[PDB]
Enzyme design. Structure first.
Site, mmCIF file in Angstrom:
data_model
loop_
_atom_site.group_PDB
_atom_site.id
_atom_site.type_symbol
_atom_site.label_atom_id
_atom_site.label_comp_id
_atom_site.label_asym_id
_atom_site.label_seq_id
_atom_site.Cartn_x
_atom_site.Cartn_y
_atom_site.Cartn_z
ATOM 1 N N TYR A 1 -5.160 0.619 2.932
ATOM 2 C CA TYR A 1 -4.202 0.525 4.014
ATOM 3 C C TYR A 1 -4.869 0.401 5.388
ATOM 4 O O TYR A 1 -4.199 0.106 6.344
ATOM 5 C CB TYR A 1 -3.151 1.656 3.996
ATOM 6 N N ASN B 1 12.438 16.910 1.596
ATOM 7 C CA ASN B 1 11.600 16.485 0.481
ATOM 8 C C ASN B 1 10.629 17.604 0.067
ATOM 9 O O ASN B 1 10.094 17.571 -1.053
ATOM 10 C CB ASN B 1 10.865 15.134 0.758
ATOM 11 N N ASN C 1 -3.501 4.360 -11.520
ATOM 12 C CA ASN C 1 -2.939 3.301 -12.354
ATOM 13 C C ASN C 1 -3.653 3.051 -13.653
ATOM 14 O O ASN C 1 -3.884 1.914 -14.025
ATOM 15 C CB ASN C 1 -2.794 2.027 -11.544
ATOM 16 N N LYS D 1 -8.719 7.173 -1.846
ATOM 17 C CA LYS D 1 -8.939 6.340 -2.988
ATOM 18 C C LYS D 1 -9.590 5.033 -2.648
ATOM 19 O O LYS D 1 -9.526 4.569 -1.516
ATOM 20 C CB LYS D 1 -7.698 6.174 -3.825
ATOM 21 N N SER E 1 5.437 6.615 -5.360
ATOM 22 C CA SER E 1 6.781 6.052 -5.300
ATOM 23 C C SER E 1 7.797 6.857 -6.092
ATOM 24 O O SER E 1 8.557 6.328 -6.911
ATOM 25 C CB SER E 1 6.751 4.602 -5.777
ATOM 26 N N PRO E 2 7.787 8.174 -5.895
ATOM 27 C CA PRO E 2 8.691 9.020 -6.674
ATOM 28 C C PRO E 2 10.169 8.859 -6.381
ATOM 29 O O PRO E 2 10.999 9.353 -7.122
ATOM 30 C CB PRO E 2 8.236 10.423 -6.307
ATOM 31 N N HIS F 1 -9.777 2.984 -8.992
ATOM 32 C CA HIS F 1 -9.410 2.034 -10.001
ATOM 33 C C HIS F 1 -10.517 0.937 -10.050
ATOM 34 O O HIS F 1 -10.975 0.489 -9.004
ATOM 35 C CB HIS F 1 -8.052 1.379 -9.623
ATOM 36 N N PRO G 1 11.839 -1.200 -5.975
ATOM 37 C CA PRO G 1 12.732 -2.182 -6.643
ATOM 38 C C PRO G 1 12.116 -2.790 -7.910
ATOM 39 O O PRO G 1 12.787 -2.894 -8.948
ATOM 40 C CB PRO G 1 12.952 -3.257 -5.568
#
Length: 262
Positions: A48, A240, A133, A77, A181-182, A107, A186
């Site tokens: 990012y 949250n 992942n 990461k 993405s809990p 990864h 989409p």
């Protein structure tokens, strides 16, 4: 508890702020607001490009006495398309203005690359090491050959993408599953929808006096997974984290098995 215990023995807070890229200042403002509200877990990623901004927010929090470094769980990461692993960690630490990470994830096309992670773990630069992942199969392959087992496999996991196979495999092996993405995305929701609009979740939220998002997060926590919700809204950031002093009753939890998967 408000944490899970990793296979290293370290405590990982079960709610953290997820990672993403935004306009200047947006992520740092969210980190600041989140920690002030009680978050003790911040997820980051070098992809990012915004670790320096996160480091400035963390530096403000520490210099204001909001939290001590030891009370925070900071993840970053690397994604490789081995020699650059310690340089990348070195760079993340510099940008974040930290001396160690609580968790460093990798990864790669999967092993020497994991060996590099193991060296950094042994050195204390990453107090735990894990993967991003990895499917059950790939995680099992890594477990078969690693000296240091992964502590975490961070994957997309939410009520519309429940990762049932990986969940069971992590339980059996002691690898911790952290859900990114809990609250859905989409591309992993039935008909490219919004999992917070699933009638089962709305119904349970209405019964318990919680938001749909609170219910979705609490489901993942009840399954034994930590969660990385992203929000820039201070009221949502607060909601949250308010996922500990109540639970989803077992009969209502059982209804999640009926949610159509992507």
């Amino acid at each position: 508890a408000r944490h899970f215990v990793l296979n290293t023995g370290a405590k990982i807070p079960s709610v953290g702020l997820g990672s993403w890229q935004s306009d200047p200042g947006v992520v740092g403002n969210a980190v600041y607001a989140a920690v002030k509200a009680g978050y003790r877990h911040i997820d980051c990623a070098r992809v990012y490009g915004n670790e320096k901004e996160i480091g400035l927010a963390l530096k403000k929090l520490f210099e204001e006495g909001v939290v001590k470094r030891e009370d925070m769980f900071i993840t970053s990461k690397l994604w490789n398309d081995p020699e650059d692993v310690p340089e990348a960690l070195n760079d993340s630490l510099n940008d974040l203005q930290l001396e160690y990470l609580d968790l460093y994830l990798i990864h790669w096309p999967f092993p020497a690359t994991w060996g590099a992670m193991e060296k950094l773990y042994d050195a204390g630069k990453a107090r735990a090491i894990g993967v991003s992942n990895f499917s059950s199969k790939k995680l099992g392959d890594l477990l078969a050959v690693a000296r240091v087992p992964p502590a975490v496999d961070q994957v997309e996991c939410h009520p519309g993408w429940q990762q049932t196979k990986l969940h069971s495999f992590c339980q059996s092996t002691g690898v911790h599953l952290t859900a990114y993405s809990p609250l859905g995305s989409p591309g992993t929701t039935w008909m490219n929808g919004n999992v917070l609009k699933e009638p089962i979740i709305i119904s349970i939220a209405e019964k318990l006096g919680k938001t749909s998002a609170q219910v979705a997060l609490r489901w993942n926590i009840q399954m034994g997974h930590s969660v990385l919700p992203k929000s820039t809204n201070e009221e949502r950031i607060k909601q949250n984290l308010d996922v500990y002093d109540w639970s989803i009753p077992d009969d209502l939890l059982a209804k999640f098995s009926e949610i159509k998967q992507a």
